[PDB]
Design a protein around this ligand. Structure first.
Ligand code: BR
Ligand code: HG
Length: 208
């Protein structure tokens, strides 16, 4: 299907203020270590004043902090979700199915992704590298997409509707009882991965 509207509105949704892209990649790479990330650590990696780091994050209202005020969630998260995202020996989580397909390229590492079909509960799993997916089980795994809304919190307007499914027929059946959800579409996990690659290329082309 035509994916330009999805790529466009997702880019808009994340690139609200400049610096977001520049801060995103290091933050994701730090979070992938499996520990909360401090604003000073980001400041040092970025060589920014910590005043700028918090400024960028304040715009990302979805951002999760822990009891110490450190960052534990931004696309990847240490707080449990339906999407398990493992790098090396660390178990992390992701906010949505598309996130699991996008972040391995941004962090430069291969992830073991697992979840459950949103319509049937069947376990699903696959290995996501920066360039390809492997061990897609079951092999006909699908993904739901919706059109991101620009001003809305991305996690509540997009992430919460973007799931894995056992198969495309299963997802479509599920989709038929989810009307009035703008842009709702079912794609193969392969097509969703390609969407993620297009998104990443556009996002990275906007860094310093
Ligand atoms: Br289009
Ligand atoms: Hg997402």
């Amino acid at each position: 299907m035509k994916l330009a509207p999805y790529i466009l509105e997702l880019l808009t949704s994340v690139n609200r203020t400049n610096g977001t892209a520049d801060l995103l990649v290091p933050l994701l790479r730090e979070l992938a270590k499996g520990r909360p990330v401090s604003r000073t650590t980001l400041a040092g990696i970025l060589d920014w004043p910590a005043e700028r780091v918090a400024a960028v994050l304040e715009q990302a209202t979805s951002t999760e902090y822990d009891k110490d005020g450190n960052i534990i969630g931004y696309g990847l998260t240490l707080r449990e979700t339906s999407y398990v995202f493992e790098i090396d020996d660390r178990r992390l989580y992701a906010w949505c199915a598309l996130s699991t397909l996008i972040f391995p390229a941004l962090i430069g590492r291969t992830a073991r992704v697992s979840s459950h079909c949103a319509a049937t509960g069947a376990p699903v799993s696959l290995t996501v590298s920066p360039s390809e997916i492997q061990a897609v089980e079951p092999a006909g795994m699908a993904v739901s997409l919706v059109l991101p809304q620009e001003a809305a919190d991305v996690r509540q307007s997009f992430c919460c509707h973007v799931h894995f499914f056992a198969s495309v027929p299963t997802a479509e059946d599920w989709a038929s009882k989810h009307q009035g959800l703008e842009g709702l579409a079912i794609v193969s996990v392969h097509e969703a991965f390609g969407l993620g690659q297009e998104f990443n290329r556009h996002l990275l082309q906007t860094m310093s």
